[PDB]
């Protein structure tokens, strides 16, 4: 099982007749580059008019594809193919920074403050466990995301591809940063079975430690936000059971087993990860911005007050890949695997309309 990005947007009922025109989506990259030949062939094969793609160098880094499809080129082309396939009217600005937290910070503030490209959306699918970040870098990052919220820019981040432990074996549960930020729309991952625009079934992405699984959990750094106050977020499963910001907010297809068809450095292939969901929803927000005639910005508070039928609730599975305790599990409403669920594009747009 494999989908084009178009088949996925169809299952999530993205609003038709909108392609992101007049909008600029920013995409953060910390390594590799994209092969233009790949994009050219991919977009055409999908029937999509070649989108404008430009690179911006940050802290001396630049677009540098190595040709190795199994390298960071794959991260980069996945970001672009998936989003560019779904908002091809939008201008894509890809910011390349050194693979450091200072570079990542700098690429994000470069994007937000861009006086020329002024992106209205920032797509992020890089990060790490919050404990791997220093308190100072965490604080700089969060000022940035707040700034973003003040400028009407939406910021979206993949919640992780390693389950509730996010890759650590220090025997604790952890969420990823920057999705853990309250000012970031955290994107979880599901397993999607769909066709002709109707989802047949959608469960938690979890293919074990070998296969990867959706990030999700309870932030140990940030306290439960006011707008999450009655979303049924639990305390972390970690002893002490501190309450904290629940991750994620929304979720989309991320299971490589029901994966995305893309072309990485010439080779046809199928990928997944929550890495595909931020750019997928980045394109949804850009289409919605076009319709609105202005950037929607920071959506987290809005999302949590929308009626339930704006989402496809995910209620089965868990995102534990380290033990059999099923920490965390899906269920009715918000859960620490899939958050509010998958959005139903046309209904989110209708709620956002005057
Ligand atoms: Ca749910």
Swiss-Prot record:
Its cofactor is Ca(2+). Autocatalytically processed. Binds 1 Ca(2+) ion per subunit. Optimum temperature is 60 degrees Celsius (for degradation of azocoll). It is found in: Secreted. Keywords: Calcium, Hydrolase, Metal-binding, Protease, Secreted, Serine protease, Zymogen. Its main location: secreted. GO terms for biological process: proteolysis. Induction: Constitutively expressed. Partially inhibited by L-alanyl-L-alanyl-L-phenylalanyl-chloromethane, leupeptin, 1 mM Fe(2+) or 1 mM Hg(2+). Insensitive to specific inhibitors of aspartic proteinases, such as pepstatin and diazoacetyl-DL-norleucine methyl ester (DAN), to specific inhibitors of metalloproteinases (EDTA), cysteine proteinases (N-ethylmaleimide) and serine proteinases (PMSF). Its EC number is 3.4.21.-. The active site is at 75 (charge relay system), 79 (charge relay system), 275 (charge relay system). GO terms for cellular component: extracellular region. Optimum pH is 3.9 (for degradation of azocoll). Stable at pH 3.5 to 5.0. Residues 2-354 form the Peptidase S53 domain. GO terms for molecular function: metal ion binding; serine-type endopeptidase activity; tripeptidyl-peptidase activity. Kumamolisin-As does not make a specific three-quarters/one-quarter cut of the triple-helical, native collagen, characteristic for the previously described collagenases. Thermostable pepstatin-insensitive serine-carboxyl proteinase. Can specifically and efficiently degrade collagen. In vitro, preferentially cleaves the bovine collagen alpha-1 chain at a single specific cleavage site. Can also hydrolyze the chromogenic substrate azocoll and synthetic peptides derived from collagen. Also shows low activity with albumin and casein, but cannot use keratin azure and elastin. Monomer. This is Kumamolisin-As. The gene is scpA.
């Amino acid at each position: 099982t494999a989908y084009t990005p178009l088949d996925v947007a169809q299952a999530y009922q993205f609003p038709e007749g909108l392609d992101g025109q007049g909008q600029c989506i920013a995409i953060i990259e910390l390594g590799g580059g994209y092969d233009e030949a790949s994009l050219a062939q991919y977009f055409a094969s999908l029937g999509v008019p070649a989108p404008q793609v430009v690179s911006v160098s940050v802290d001396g880094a630049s677009n540098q594809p190595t040709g190795d499809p199994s390298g960071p080129d794959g991260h980069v082309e996945l970001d672009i193919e998936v989003a560019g396939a779904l908002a091809p009217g939008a201008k894509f600005a890809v910011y390349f920074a050194p693979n450091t937290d200072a570079g990542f910070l700098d690429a994000i503030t470069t994007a937000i403050h861009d006086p020329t490209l002024k992106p209205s959306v920032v797509s992020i699918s890089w990060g790490g466990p919050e404990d791997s970040w220093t308190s100072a870098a965490i604080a700089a990052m969060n000022r940035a995301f707040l700034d973003a919220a003040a400028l009407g820019v939406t910021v979206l981040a993949a919640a992780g591809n390693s389950g509730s432990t996010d890759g650590e074996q220090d025997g604790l549960y952890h969420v990823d940063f920057p999705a853990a930020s309250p000012y970031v729309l955290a994107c979880g991952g599901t397993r999607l079975v769909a066709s002709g625009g109707r989802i047949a079934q959608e469960t938690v992405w979890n293919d074990g430690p070998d296969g990867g699984a959706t990030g999700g959990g309870v932030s140990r750094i940030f306290p439960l936000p006011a707008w999450q106050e009655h979303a049924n977020v639990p305390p972390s499963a970690n002893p002490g059971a501190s309450s904290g910001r629940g991750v994620p907010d929304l979720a989309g297809n991320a299971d490589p087993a029901t994966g995305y068809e893309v072309v990485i450095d010439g080779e046809a292939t199928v990928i997944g990860g929550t890495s595909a969901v931020a750019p997928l929803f980045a394109a949804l927000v850009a289409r919605i911005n076009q319709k609105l005639g202005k950037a929607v910005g920071y959506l987290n508070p809005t999302l949590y007050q929308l009626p339930a039928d704006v989402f496809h609730d995910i209620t089965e599975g868990n995102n534990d890949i380290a033990n059999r305790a099923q920490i965390y599990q899906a269920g009715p409403g918000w859960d620490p695997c899939t958050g509010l669920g998958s959005p139903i594009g046309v209904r989110l747009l209708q709620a956002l309309l005057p």
